Design a protein around this ligand. Structure first.
Ligand SMILES: [K+]
Ligand SMILES: [Mg+2]
Ligand SMILES: [Mg+2]
Ligand SMILES: [Mg+2]
Length: 95
RNA sequence: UUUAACAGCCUGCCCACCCUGGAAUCGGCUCAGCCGGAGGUAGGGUCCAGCGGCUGGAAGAGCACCGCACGUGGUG
């Protein structure tokens, strides 16, 4: 899994959690990798992927729901999707 | 010791909704709940209810009281 690599970003890299900020980072091209939970709304999932394809940003489908993804990020709330701005330590390379 | 339908304007309950923004030292919140990265708090807006407010209707009416005549005037 990517929980170990994702944990490193939470303390050494730059990221935005949530659907509204993820679109913002894709619009400004600050996002380098987008991670989406498996229970994300199907329409929202397609919209994010279309945005990422338009901005030439890689998309990773997380193996877990928004509850699991939020826990992986070390947060006490659900996260449907997130964007990584600064990888920090070998997250965008091996994905 | 009063103020109808109706007409215009204002107000904008409890909710719902929109924009900005991005939250752990978690916070907001009800009598009770409960709500928030599926975007809270906060700031600024939109909409909805009315058996709500103002004016018109409408004081010319009604009521009370005091007169003059035996209808008519005044005050509130
Ligand atoms: K009526
Ligand atoms: Mg608000
Ligand atoms: Mg009046
Ligand atoms: Mg009168």
């Amino acid at each position: 899994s990517i929980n170990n690599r994702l944990a490193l970003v939470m303390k050494s890299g730059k990221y935005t959690l949530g659907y509204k900020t993820v679109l913002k980072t894709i619009r400004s091209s600050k996002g380098k990798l987008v991670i989406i939970a498996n229970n994300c709304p199907p329409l929202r999932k397609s919209e994010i992927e279309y945005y990422a394809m338009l901005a030439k940003v890689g998309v990773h489908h997380y193996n877990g729901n928004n509850v699991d993804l939020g826990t992986a990020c070390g947060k006490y709330y659900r996260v449907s999707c997130l964007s990584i701005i600064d990888p920090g330590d070998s997250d965008i390379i091996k994905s």
